Amino acid sequence: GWRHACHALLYAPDPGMLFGRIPLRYAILMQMRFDGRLGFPGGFVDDRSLEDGLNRELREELGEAAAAFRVERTDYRSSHVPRVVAHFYAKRLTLEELLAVEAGATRAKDHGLEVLGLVRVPLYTLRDGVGGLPTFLENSFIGSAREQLLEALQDLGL
Amino acid sequence: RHACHALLYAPDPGMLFGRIPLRYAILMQMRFDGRLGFPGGFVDTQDRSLEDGLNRELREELGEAAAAFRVERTDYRSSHVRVVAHFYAKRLTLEELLAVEAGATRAKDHGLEVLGLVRVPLYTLRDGVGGLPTFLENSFIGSAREQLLEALQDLGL
Ligand SMILES: [Mn+2]
C-alpha cells in the first residue's frame, strides 16, 4: 500500500559549553540532503525488516561506525504521513559513538552525493533571540522533519 | 575591523543518481548561529597579513589537513563592507579537499563554533527547485550568499 521510509534522531549528551558560557545539552545529528534540505538520516526501506532498512541506510549515509550500534524496534518513535509513510526513530548514543559517526561520515557511500554533510542542531538560543535554534529552524527541511525534531525535543523536556 | 573567508573547491567526477554531474565539491560550514557561511573569521594585529590570518583560522576550523595548502593574495576575489569581509577562492585537488572534510571533525571548532561542513549542490533537480535554488533559500551569515553567487558565476556555473 505505502512506500515506507525510516529516519533516526541520533543524539548524545554533550557537557560542552559554547564560548565557555553557553550549554549545549545534546549532540543531535541531521544531514544536509542532496536537494539542499535538512533532514534526518535514513531513507526508504525495501530489506527484511523496517529496522533492517533503517540501519542499512544509516550505514550507507554515515559509514561503518554506524554498525557500532543498531536502531531497534525498541527505539521506535513515531509514524507520520506522496504515499510515503515516515517512521521516526530516536537512538541515544554516547558522545563517543556520535563523534565517531561524524568522522566516518566523510567516507560513507553517500558522501558528496545523497548526503552533502552532517550538522548538529543548535539547542541553545543566542543573545539576540534569533541566533542558534530559531535561525536553524528557518532553513528548509524535507517533509515533517522540522515537526519530528520539535516533537522529539519536547520528549526530552527541551 | 577585517574578516577573511575562503571558498575551497575541487572537481568531483561524481554523477548524482548516475546522471547529474557534481562539478565541484564546494565547502561551506553551518555556524553555531544556525547560518551557512564560509570557513574563516576575524583577522587581527597578531596576524599582519590578511592571508596569514585566514590560513590560521582554517587550521582552527578545519584542522591540520588545511596545512597541506596555503591560500594566497593571488586567490583574493572580493571585499564587502564597521567590518570588511575579504573573500578568497582556492582550488584544491579532491583528495586535499577530502582530507579537510575528514579533518574538520577533529578541529578545535567542531561541535562548537562549527556545527558541521556541507557541500554546495551545484545542480538543479528536474522539478526546478531542488538542489542549488533551495540551498540558497537557507539562512546565510553576512555577505556569504552573494560571495557564493559571485564565485559560481566567475567559475562559469
Ligand atoms: Mn559583491
Numbering used by the authors:
A (entry chain B): 18 to 63, 66 to 100, 104 to 180
B (entry chain A): 20 to 100, 105 to 180
Which statements did the authors publish about this structure?
Among the Nudix proteins, Nudt16 is the most promiscuous. To understand the molecular mechanism for the recognition of FAD-capped RNA by Nudt16, we determined the crystal structure of human Nudt16 in complex with FAD at 2.7 Å resolution and the structure of free human Nudt16 at 2.3 Å resolution.
The overall structure of Nudt16 is similar to those reported earlier, with rms distances of approximately 0.6 Å for the dimer.
